[PDB]
């Protein structure tokens, strides 16, 4: 498979997650999403077929996660926007005020603006810190994935948000929307993984 | 997931 940060991709046959971005660790090819997503050793597919395996997670505390995908998968700079793409150009961490976008399989991509950090979401199995908050709108499924900004800069991946009966906050005004995704740089550093740009 |  074609790996594309949004893209959707099945967790041992049951739940579904967004890609967040393609990596390397050395000669391993993989993507990071977020770690909620799957436990270490399950089945990552695309398309019905298996592409790898959680290799390592941090959930709850953190929020994050790596695939290490088969060396037949295909490593891509791009994060899917519609048909079109956003090109990954590195994982300079942008301030409160930017604009931010994300992209995932549930609400496509979206955008607003990011407005708080070192945020705490309390979720079932324990609490999250240090996550980043956003208003752009997001909605179940839409874990994992990309949050980048318009010129290519890798923020995080998805990891929460204060989704509403409809299983999503695009419903409700940007001004009521916390969209919350987990620091991309502390993901990189943690597994030793190196960005796939273009 | 939802914050609670």
Known sequence: ?198 | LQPI
């Open chain 1, 1 to 198: 498979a074609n790996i594309v940060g949004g893209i959707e991709y099945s967790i041992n046959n049951a739940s579904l997650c967004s890609v967040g971005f393609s990596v390397t660790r050395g000669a391993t090819k993989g993507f990071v999403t977020a770690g909620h997503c799957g436990t270490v050793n399950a089945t990552a597919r695309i398309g019905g077929a298996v592409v790898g395996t959680f290799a390592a997670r941090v959930f709850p505390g953190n929020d994050a996660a790596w695939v290490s995908l088969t060396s037949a998968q295909t490593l891509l700079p791009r994060v899917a926007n519609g048909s079109s793409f956003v090109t990954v150009r590195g994982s300079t961490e942008a301030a409160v005020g930017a604009a931010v976008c994300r992209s995932g399989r549930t609400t496509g991509y979206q955008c607003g603006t990011i407005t708080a950090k070192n945020v705490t979401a309390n979720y079932a199995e324990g609490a999250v810190r240090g996550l980043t908050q956003g208003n752009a709108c997001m909605g179940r499924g839409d874990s994992g994935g990309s949050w980048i900004t318009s010129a290519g800069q890798a923020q995080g991946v998805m990891s929460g948000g204060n989704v509403q009966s409809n299983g999503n906050n695009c419903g409700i005004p940007a001004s009521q929307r916390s969209s919350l995704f987990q620091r991309l740089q502390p993901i990189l550093s943690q597994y030793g993984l190196s960005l796939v740009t273009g």
